[PDB]
Amino acid sequence: MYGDLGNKLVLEAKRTKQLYARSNQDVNLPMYHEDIIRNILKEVSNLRKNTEYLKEQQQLGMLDDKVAKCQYFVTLLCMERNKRCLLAYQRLRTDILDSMAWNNNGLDTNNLSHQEQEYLKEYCDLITDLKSGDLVDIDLSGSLVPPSDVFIDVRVLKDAGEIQTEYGVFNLIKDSQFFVRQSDVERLIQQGYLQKI
């Protein structure tokens, strides 16, 4: 029946939402199901051809006020259902992409559809526009854990040599440990070079 592929697609949606929700990290989302989506879009085209065929044969008009009305209603509702299933899948994966944009890129690519790849590019461009115009005094993409401490100890987890900061340097020697202002190192904790807190 015309709705079954929609159920299979949104079961895929439910499983990938759980795959994202259960883990503490941002898990890189799974492959875009082009095959099931092609099957559903083909089903939509079948339903469109059915409506065209019926609306042509309404000029012959077989009990049309009830029978053709009912046939048209059912084949229209099948298309509404399949639109809902497709949009549910795409809106979920869109939400995950937006979450990933804020969590990383505002500071696995094969799995996206090419529309989703260019969508993500545009949404990252939008985020970087927000933290560039007005309100730029706040890095709007920064952390949402409240600042617990102004100075922290941080252990260098990967080597990165001598780099500057606003009035000094760090030499990121492997398994050296700093005691430093948190606001000067947060970028490197997010990039995974520094360990603690």
Partner 1 sequence: VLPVKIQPPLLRPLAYRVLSRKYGLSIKSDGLSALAEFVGTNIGANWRQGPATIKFLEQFAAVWKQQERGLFIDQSGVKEVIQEMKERLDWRDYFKVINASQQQRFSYNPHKMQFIFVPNKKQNGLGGIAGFLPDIEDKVQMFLTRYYLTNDRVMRNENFQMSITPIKNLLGRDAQNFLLLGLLNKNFKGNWSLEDPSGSVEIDISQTIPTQGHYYVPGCMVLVEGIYYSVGNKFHVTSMTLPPGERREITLETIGNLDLLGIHGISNNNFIARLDKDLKIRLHLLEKELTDHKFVILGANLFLDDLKIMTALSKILQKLNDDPPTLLIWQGSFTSVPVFASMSSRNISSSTQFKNNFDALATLLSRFDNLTENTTMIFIPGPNDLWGSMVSLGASGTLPQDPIPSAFTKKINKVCKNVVWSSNPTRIAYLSQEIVIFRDDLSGRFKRHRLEFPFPQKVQETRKLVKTILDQGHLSPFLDSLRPISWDLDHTLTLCPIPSTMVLCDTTSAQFDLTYNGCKVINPGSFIHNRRARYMEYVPSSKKTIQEEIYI
Contact letters for partner 1, residues 92-111 (x by CB under 8 A): ---------------x-xx-
Task: Establish if 188 lies at the interface with partner 1 (CB under 8 A).
Answer: yes
Task: Establish if 134 lies at the interface with partner 1 (CB under 8 A).
Answer: no
Contact letters for partner 1, residues 23-52 (x by CB under 8 A): --------x--xx--x---x----------
Which listed residue (138, 149, 162, 179) binds partner 1 by CB under 8 A?
A: 162
Task: Establish if 19 lies at the interface with partner 1 (CB under 8 A).
Answer: no
Only segment of 6-14, 59-67, 78-86, 125-133 that touches partner 1 (CB under 8 A): 125-133
Buried b (16+ CB within 10 A) or exposed e, 35-58: ebbebbeebbeebeebeeebeeee
Task: Establish if 81 lies at the interface with partner 1 (CB under 8 A).
Answer: no
| Strand 168-172, strand 177-181: pairing | unpaired
Task: Establish if 179 lies at the interface with partner 1 (CB under 8 A).
Answer: no
Residues that bind partner 1 (CB under 8 A): 31, 34-35, 38, 42, 107, 109-110, 114, 128, 131-132, 136, 139, 160-167, 169, 187-188, 190-191
